[PDB]
Copies of this chain bind each other. A is one copy, B any other.
């Protein structure tokens, strides 16, 4: 072991869905539109 706390408390991470760059651009475009509705 390590002798200190072994884990974080957030328990949150990013993802990887093999999203293409164009798909990511389109997703960001659609997000901002809804937010600025």
A residues engaging B (CB < 8 A)? Answer: 8-12, 15-16, 18
Contact = CB atoms under 8 A, between A and B. Distances in A.
Contact of A9 (B10, B11, B16): B16
Contacts of A15: 9
A9 B16 CA distance: 6
A33 to B, nearest CB: 18
A31 to B, nearest CB: 13
Contacts of A10: 16, 18
Contact of A8 (B9, B11, B12, B16): B16
A18 B8 CA distance: 11
Nearest to A15: B9
